[PDB]
Design a protein around this ligand. Sequence first.
Ligand SMILES: [Zn+2]
Ligand SMILES: [Zn+2]
Lengths: 330, 330
Amino acid sequence: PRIDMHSHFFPRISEQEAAKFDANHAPWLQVSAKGDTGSIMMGKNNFRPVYQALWDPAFRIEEMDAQGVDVQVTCATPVMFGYTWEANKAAQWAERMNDFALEFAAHNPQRIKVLAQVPLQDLDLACKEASRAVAAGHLGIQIGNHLGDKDLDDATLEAFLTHCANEDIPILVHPWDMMGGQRMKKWMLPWLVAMPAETQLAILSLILSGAFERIPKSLKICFGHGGGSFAFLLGAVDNAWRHRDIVREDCPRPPSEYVDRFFVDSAVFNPGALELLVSVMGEDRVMLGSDYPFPLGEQKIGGLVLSSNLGESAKDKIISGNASKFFNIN
Amino acid sequence: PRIDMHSHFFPRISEQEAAKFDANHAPWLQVSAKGDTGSIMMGKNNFRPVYQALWDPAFRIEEMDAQGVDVQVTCATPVMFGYTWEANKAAQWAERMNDFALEFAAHNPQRIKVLAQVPLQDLDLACKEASRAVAAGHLGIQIGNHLGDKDLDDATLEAFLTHCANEDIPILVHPWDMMGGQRMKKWMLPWLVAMPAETQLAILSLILSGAFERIPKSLKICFGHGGGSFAFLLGAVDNAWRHRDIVREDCPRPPSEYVDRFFVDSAVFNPGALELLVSVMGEDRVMLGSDYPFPLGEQKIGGLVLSSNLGESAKDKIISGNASKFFNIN
Ligand SMILES: [Zn+2]
Ligand SMILES: [Zn+2]
């Protein structure tokens, strides 16, 4: 079947319910009276216009049919993370969101799988939430790729990964809270420039810090959006490792050898980019992700893989094989 | 014949010559009695230790012999920019670095060419410095993407491109200066992540702002380092342009259609990445650049292009053809 392992949801939360958590920074969902469109709010502010398939599981199915998608793995919209909040409030939030997801998916748990969020600022509460959420349904965890000035090499984030590997919980790493600051507002530049750099930073943070050495090889970790610009700029990285002390210091093998340690989704929107990606990662390590139902995710899901010059077996693993093994969908 | 269009020098200046500009911001060169070592200086502290090839054309002429390199275009180390300085002092400084670059060049003007630097913080001072310098023999200009602490590139910058496009003054745009704030502190991550991003941002800035519609097709502009991650991320840009009216707002054609308006150098350190780059830019708009003499410079200049499953006609254009037309070199 077709397995789309990168999609998003947003739960039914009213302004008042989100107010209890944080009347200013807790997101919620404003739906039209018809019920077809809607907005993600943020206190009183409009954040991002959305539509029915983000909150409605039934309505999501009828698009899951038209696109030929059999099983969808879905998870929190990044605005729900709340990594900057006080920890207990966040842990409570993350528990409530993971509950909403199970509800969402339970409409038809055969086709809709979910991933959990965690209060990643607090290592203890994050591990607790991850175990709890998986035992209760979720097939794994989605996290943002960094926590303020902390990247995946931070010991707190490295310890979370280790915990997930110990308990055989699979992780999807998603870019969010993009760098760039004031210079990238127009033309969705944060999406096009900062977001792939964020992801590539995350991957390189694990590799060059030595982290993969101190993390069990049993960890299932996947990077969204093709690993960003990772696969393309990897040559420049091997070259820096070869010729600079400071680059080599904590990384014992050539950085390129580490593609055996993680996965990437397939959303790179270009036949040749996909072929370089598969070349670097191997057909075993790339999975179909659409970024549904957001405006700039692949509009015909799986379109790019199937239209490619890849072997029938390579097209099968990517569209199905690798995510049945990765998330243990049978 | 063999042309490396991307390299760097630093002038033969003393603590005192530079003192007359600044005691703690104007950089100068210190070399030991064993005239082989050397180090760039700021005040009385080491800013950057330095290979003998960086200053001293004599040694350079010999390394160009060992390498396949007949002609090498060379320019400022971005340390020498000073786009933060007051517009007048930075006009004085600029021209001195361009005289210092003409004495360097006049040690073999058949083999050593020079690009000028401009006081880009003031539009007219820079325009004047530019015309003045190409007239003195410089084959063109090298500019950063900022202003020491700047947000990208407005219509002031677009004017400077127009000035150059009209007097046929070629420009090499060189990624420089940060992006990562308090992140990316180890393993040369700014060079591996932030620098490719900066370059791709410069490119997309020109394209998505519609700038190429106001800029005469006469413009000769090259982007350092393979144009960063541009080629690989292009499919994503195109996808966004077509699914979001804000991306398309100032950009009347698909962004990918604009590849005919600029050049990139070839320094991407990987045959697969170079093959995608050529397939996107076309063999006519990729030139050989090594980043000599820096430690992350290509070791065997030309090596990656020569060794490629590319075409032979393609290989001569890259090595020679394109950079002959671009700088006007015979
Ligand atoms: Zn996503
Ligand atoms: Zn350079």
